[PDB]
Design a protein around this ligand. Structure first.
Ligand SMILES: Cc1ccc(F)cc1Oc1c(C(=O)N2CCNCC2)c2ccnc(Cc3ccccc3)c2n1-c1ccccc1
Ligand SMILES: Cc1ccc(F)cc1Oc1c(C(=O)N2CCNCC2)c2ccnc(Cc3ccccc3)c2n1-c1ccccc1
Ligand SMILES: *[C@@H]1O[C@H](CO)[C@@H](O)[C@H](O)[C@H]1NC(C)=O
Length: 340
């Protein structure tokens, strides 16, 4: 490890409190892409100009054209990336990537197969994996590992700030700091929780409290700190019990409560590293109305993550909005502080 004296920041756009994305430039001259920065994955990918136009997602998203780049280096190794909500398939390519003022030579996926669901619902074009090399498909060096190798960053850490609002604009949607943290977006001090294993941004959770009593995760469970996930997720059985306690009901892809009942829902506390991380109903209910005639969605869903990573809870944008998050690679730990 070689450390420098610089930090780099990536300004994020907040789309409806569900999507947080920044811009990256690829090639010479740069081709700009809207990307989600995901601690739950380790690969970089953008849709390719070689993606057949019968993939509707490829007609609607920005495509990388290797034939328009003078710094492109051919590879062609076939690559399939299987996520929680979808799969992308393509080939590996090498080019110069610009991330918040930093220029880095990177091997990335050129996506030729991009299904309509969920990609047509996506505001971002691609993904920048913030996970470890051990979980990278095709043993490709992740972008942060390649930035660290330059010897410019002050610390072997990166931090996430996700703002509220989304609806009104003018305000900063969010921010990623490479090589440090931004004291302007957090208050008090960081509390760290050590990783259960290197290779994955996952920590031990001691319990989940719904109101007064510790209803769930009695005798521990796992928690994935997932920046690319919109909500807080748990297994079907854990969520079924949590939602029964809240009076919520299953609706295809989400749970809903009567809008008027939203402000009466209890606090949900996550027991991580001896500290209690509390979300009130305003932090987990999308209060679109206070009407008894309308149904309001919850920012908590069921997601069955399979082994080796799962069964596991995922702490996404819903958690991050409340708690400014620092990802420490040098010490294999995650830090939380109250966001401001
Ligand atoms: C496909 C994908 C890759 C990387 C990434 F950062 C996010 C990704 O997309 C993912 C997830 C998801 O698959 N995750 C797995 C990897 N870590 C982040 C969550 C994912 C998990 C849970 N909920 C949503 C919300 C959702 C689910 C279905 C349809 C609409 C919205 C997810 N989305 C997503 C898809 C489209 C637009 C916005 C988000
Ligand atoms: C439009 C529609 C009508 C009847 C119906 F049975 C389903 C419908 O579609 C619905 C929803 C949905 O059920 N809605 C009803 C309540 N409010 C939102 C739309 C619905 C609710 C939340 N998220 C998605 C998006 C989504 C997509 C994939 C994975 C996760 C999430 C939804 N889709 C949907 C949209 C496009 C394609 C497929 C489904
Ligand atoms: C692709 O690049 C990587 C560099 O690590 C290597 O595994 C492989 O030999 C390359 N394949 C081609 C066809 O250039």
């Amino acid at each position: 490890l070689t450390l420098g004296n610089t930090t780099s920041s990536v300004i994020l756009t907040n789309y409806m409190d569900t999507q947080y994305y920044g811009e990256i430039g690829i090639g010479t001259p740069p081709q700009t892409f809207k990307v989600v920065f995901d601690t739950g994955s380790s690969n970089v990918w953008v849709p390719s100009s070689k993606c057949s136009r019968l993939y509707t997602a490829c007609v609607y998203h920005k495509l990388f054209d290797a034939s328009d780049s003078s710094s492109y280096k051919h590879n062609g190794t076939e690559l399939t990336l299987r996520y929680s909500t979808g799969t992308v398939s393509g080939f590996l390519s090498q080019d110069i990537i610009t991330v918040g003022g930093i220029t880095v030579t990177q091997m990335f996926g050129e996506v030729t197969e991009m299904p309509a669901l969920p990609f047509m619902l996506a505001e971002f074009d691609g993904v920048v994996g913030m996970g470890f090399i051990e979980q990278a498909i095709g043993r490709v060096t992740p972008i942060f590992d390649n930035i660290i190798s330059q010897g410019v960053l002050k610390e072997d850490v990166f931090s996430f700030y996700y703002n509220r609002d989304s609806e009104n604009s003018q305000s900063l949607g969010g921010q990623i700091v490479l090589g440090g943290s931004d004291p302007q977006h957090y208050e008090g001090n960081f509390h760290y929780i050590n990783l259960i294993k290197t290779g994955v941004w996952q920590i031990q959770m001691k319990g989940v409290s719904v109101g007064s009593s510790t209803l769930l995760c009695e005798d521990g469970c796992l928690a994935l700190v997932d920046t690319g996930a919109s909500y807080i997720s748990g297994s079907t059985s854990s969520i079924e019990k949590l939602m029964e306690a809240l009076g919520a009901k299953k609706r295809l892809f989400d749970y809903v409560v009567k809008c008027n009942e939203g402000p009466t829902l209890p606090d949900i506390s996550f027991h991580l590293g001896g500290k209690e991380y509390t979300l009130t109903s305003a932090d987990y209910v999308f209060q679109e109305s206070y009407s008894s005639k309308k149904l309001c969605t919850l920012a908590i869903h069921a997601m069955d993550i399979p082994p080796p990573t799962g069964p596991t809870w995922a702490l996404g944008a819903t958690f991050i909005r409340k708690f400014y998050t620092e990802f420490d690679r040098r010490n294999n730990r995650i830090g939380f502080a109250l966001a401001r």
